[PDB]
Design a protein around this ligand. Structure first.
Ligand SMILES: COC[C@]12C[C@](C(N)=O)(CN1C(=O)Cc1ccccc1OC)C2
Ligand SMILES: [Zn+2]
Length: 139
């Protein structure tokens, strides 16, 4: 679990969005595993606008933060799950690091701010859904 709170928006993994997120929907993209909903309270986070390929992410299954080197956002095949059919997930960045399914939502940050959230993993890999291209989050 986890969310980014920026301005009057809440960013979550689309597969973990609540009934309230869908009732206050702003934008969603099944191919990116992202959903953004509107909020009444002003957010606590700032979004990075950069090309960093290193950062630190929060891993809830270890209660710890880990440093990572990750690939640029790209189209990567993701096996079928209870949430999605077998498909290519876009704007995904992979790195070597621990992750379990419940780690989705953990924030990845660089020195400039929030980069993305955990969305995939397995076998010593962790995948993050990028949010740096969503310029409208800032206004
Ligand atoms: C239970 O499946 C949830 C989803 C489907 C997902 C999607 N983006 O399509 C991928 N999932 C995974 O669970 C992948 C996974 C497997 C092993 C370890 C960690 C890990 O994710 C953090 C999110
Ligand atoms: Zn950066």
């Amino acid at each position: 679990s986890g969310a980014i709170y920026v301005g009057n928006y809440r960013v979550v993994n689309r597969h973990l969005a609540t009934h309230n997120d869908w009732a206050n929907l702003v934008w969603e993209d099944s191919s990116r595993d992202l959903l953004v909903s509107s909020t009444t309270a002003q957010g606590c986070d700032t979004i990075a606008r950069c090309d960093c390929q290193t950062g630190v992410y929060y891993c809830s299954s270890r209660r710890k933060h880990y440093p990572v080197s990750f690939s640029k956002p790209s189209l990567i095949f993701v096996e079928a799950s209870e949430y999605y059919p077998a498909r290519y997930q876009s704007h995904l960045m992979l790195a070597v690091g621990h992750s379990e399914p419940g780690d989705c939502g953990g924030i990845l940050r660089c020195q400039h701010g929030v980069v993305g959230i955990v969305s995939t993993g397995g076998n010593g890999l962790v995948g993050f859904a990028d949010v740096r291209d969503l310029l409208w989050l800032d206004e």
